């Protein structure tokens, strides 16, 4: 038996840590199909902003045009989504890129020889030798000048080495950065790894006090099993600490006295980010997509 | 291909959404079938798998020159001991979860780091379709050629397969 | 060629840690194990992207056909 008011009693969240980049939390007493649905939407459905069309005016470097375009699209941009809307690819290119859809970035680099005396390091030897991702300059086309004036568009990781040059060579491009989801292409995925692990369970069956208690410590990570003496003998302190190495089953001394299993409802999510959004906010955005993924079907005519 | 003669075609590009993930959160780049290995007998791939994984963890690179290991000094017990020092499974296995259903898999999956290759000949220029097109002027039969929209040959042996089925209208 | 922007398997941005990693090994005189762990790389899918990179662009940039000699 199941109820939507019995789910509210038993479901608990324990947030272990939180950061501007990663977030470790728990989901007690939820289903493996619900927890997998939250995992997928964070990877494949929560939208992000990435460079989709790259317009080269000149590229006299070594890195090919279709390679250097691909490296720009993989740069994580610190645009907050829902400041953009979605593009519409059924209407032509002169109608398609309004400033509500598109963020325009550009790059203009020319490498020259530097007069310097000494093998020597190539940043003390040329000018604009290494092209970093912070050289993507934000061009506020239109009304973006006043609404992106509190938060300018800049990569979340500015020291991404995009290219390298030598004197004579140049890169002169301009990219159009558009909103999309990560099931289209892996560049629009907001997250480094949004993934859960299931809670380990260490079931002791017989007491292992004594010399057994000392090496059964070393079959687990160094904070999992606790020992005092024969008094307060052997138990789990933190099963969440345990990596499931199955290192105790390879010893015939302990291959009977423990059953390694899992708690099948306690999930341990590790959500990270590329840097556009915070990982507690790509989880609210993920739990609301699955909600709206079913409002759209409830409010829909059952055709045929 | 790997460096052991385990080549094979890319049969499908498979999304991360429904590709199995680990305790660590690692979707593998390459899934290889375990039914490749019993008849090919590339157990150098089973020890390259658990020695690349140990080397990517500890940051070291390992020697794979032949006749360095003995029968008393098996590499499954050498590189496997380097996985147990990190905090992994000794046997190269690793707990995986299903990317489709979401439940954990039945046993632990043998995952590691193997060096792969990409063969130069590709299927970009192999095939042809033809509905109708140019002919040969002596025979009024479709021309030969992959570029010029040429026909498929139904030769002497393919003719006899159509007499064998008894179908006189597929031969016609 | 140049260091890839993102890791192939997880998706961490890794392209900003190649010039950091070479200065960790040259000046701090660390080993490759600690220098990867200082840079926040701790999944072995994501370790090998910096660990096992060749960086052949330095050999390609020696052939500049725009500059004399």
């Amino acid at each position: 038996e199941w109820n939507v008011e019995k789910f509210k009693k038993d479901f608990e969240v324990n947030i272990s840590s939180l950061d501007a980049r990663e977030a470790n939390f728990d989901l007690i007493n939820i289903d493996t199909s619900i927890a997998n649905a939250f995992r997928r939407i964070m990877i494949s459905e929560v939208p992000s902003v990435a460079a989709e069309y790259v317009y080269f005016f000149n590229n006299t470097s070594v890195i090919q045009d279709e390679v250097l375009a691909h490296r720009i699209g993989l740069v994580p941009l610190k645009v907050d989504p829902d400041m953009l809307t979605w593009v519409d690819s059924n209407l032509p290119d002169d109608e398609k890129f309004t400033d509500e859809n598109t963020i325009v970035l550009s790059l203009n680099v020319k490498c020259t020889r530097n007069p310097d005396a000494p093998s020597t390091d190539p940043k003390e030897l040329y000018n604009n030798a290494h092209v970093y991702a912070r050289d993507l300059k934000f061009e506020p086309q239109g009304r973006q000048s006043t609404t992106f004036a509190d938060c300018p568009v800049v990569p979340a990781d500015p020291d991404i080495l995009l290219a390298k040059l030598r004197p004579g060579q140049e890169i002169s491009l301009k990219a159009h950065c558009i909103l999309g989801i990560g099931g289209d292409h892996a560049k629009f995925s907001p997250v480094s790894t949004a993934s859960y692990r299931l809670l380990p369970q260490i079931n002791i069956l017989q007491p292992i006090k004594g010399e057994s208690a000392r090496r059964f410590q070393k079959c687990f990570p160094p904070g999992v099993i606790g020992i005092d003496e024969g008094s307060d003998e052997a138990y789990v302190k933190d099963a969440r600490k345990d990596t499931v190495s199955r290192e105790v089953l390879r010893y015939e001394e302990f291959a009977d006295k423990v059953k390694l299993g899992r708690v099948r409802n306690h999930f341990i999510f590790n959500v990270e980010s590329a840097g556009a959004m915070t990982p507690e906010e790509i989880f609210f955005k993920s739990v609301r997509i699955l909600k709206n993924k079913a409002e759209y079907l409830k409010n829909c005519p059952i055709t045929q | 291909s790997s460096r052991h003669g385990q080549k094979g075609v890319c049969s499908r590009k498979w999304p991360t959404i429904d590709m199995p993930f680990s305790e660590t959160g690692i979707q593998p780049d390459i899934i290889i079938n375990p039914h490749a290995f019993p008849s090919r007998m590339t157990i150098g791939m089973f020890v390259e798998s658990l020695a690349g994984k140990a080397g990517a963890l500890h940051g070291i690179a390992q020697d794979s020159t032949p006749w360095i290991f003995n029968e008393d000094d098996t590499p499954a017990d050498y590189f496997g001991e380097q996985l147990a020092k990190a905090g992994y499974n000794y046997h190269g296995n690793e707990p995986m979860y299903s990317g489709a259903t979401g439940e954990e898999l039945r046993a632990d999956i043998y995952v590691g780091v193997v060096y792969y290759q990409r063969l130069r000949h590709m299927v970009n220029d192999k095939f042809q379709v033809r509905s109708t097109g140019p002919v040969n002027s002596l025979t009024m039969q479709p021309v030969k050629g992959r570029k010029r929209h040429g026909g498929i040959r139904v030769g002497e042996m393919e003719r006899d397969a159509l007499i064998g089925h008894g179908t006189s209208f597929l031969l016609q | 060629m140049i260091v890839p922007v993102r890791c192939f398997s997880c998706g961490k941005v890794v392209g900003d840690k190649w010039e950091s990693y070479l200065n960790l090994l040259q000046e701090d005189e660390l080993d490759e194990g600690t220098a990867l762990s200082r840079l926040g790389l701790k999944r072995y899918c994501c370790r090998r992207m910096i660990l096992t990179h060749v960086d052949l662009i330095e050999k390609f940039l020696r052939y500049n056909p725009l500059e004399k000699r």
Binding site: P222, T243, N270 | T24, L57, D63, N70, Y78, A86 | -
Partner: peptide, 24 residues
């Protein structure tokens, strides 16, 4: 015949999701 040498200083570098060097 010489063994294949045990590489020395090889300590733990696999921690669970959200753990760090909290093991001394």
């Amino acid at each position: 015949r010489k063994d294949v040498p045990k590489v020395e200083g090889l300590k733990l570098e696999h921690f669970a999701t959200g753990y760090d060097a909290e093991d001394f």
